[PDB]
Amino acid sequence: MADKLKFEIIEELIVLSENAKGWRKELNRVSWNDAEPKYDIRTWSPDHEKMGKGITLSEEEFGVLLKELGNKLEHHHHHH
Amino acid sequence: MADKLKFEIIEELIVLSENAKGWRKELNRVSWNDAEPKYDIRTWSPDHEKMGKGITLSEEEFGVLLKELGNKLEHHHHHH
Known part of the structure; x- marks a missing residue:
């Protein structure tokens, strides 16, 4: 029984940016509740101890x- | 003067899937609080009236x- 979700990071795909506190907004692959x-x-935190806004x-x-x-x-436009 | 953050959807890019209530997990271009x-x-809601878990x-x-x-x-990951 769990009133909470569980998360285990399987693979780190792309780090998009890093904060002054370290907090990195990254794309990864995580397993939730030992499931799919x-x-x-x-x-995520630099230590991955915490997390926030994401999907x-x-x-x-x-x-x-x-x-x-x-x-x-196909639309080759350089992002800043 | 707004407690919540102001936002407006400037353009839609990708719809990844649609919920039973319609709520679509999508990638779109939004302008936050009259800024860039x-x-x-x-x-998002199908009407885009609301939003939730995302970044x-x-x-x-x-x-x-x-x-x-x-x-x-490069990896032929069949997403299946």
């Missing part, structure tokens, strides 16, 4: 992300 | 995301 591992994107994505959904982002890359 | 629009990835991405972070995902597309 999926893609997670949020701001869970399945292999299907993140698959759609890869597809459509890959399409949009 | 950025990339946002979260679950802000700038030119910097979204650019790095596109890059390193574009690398990862």
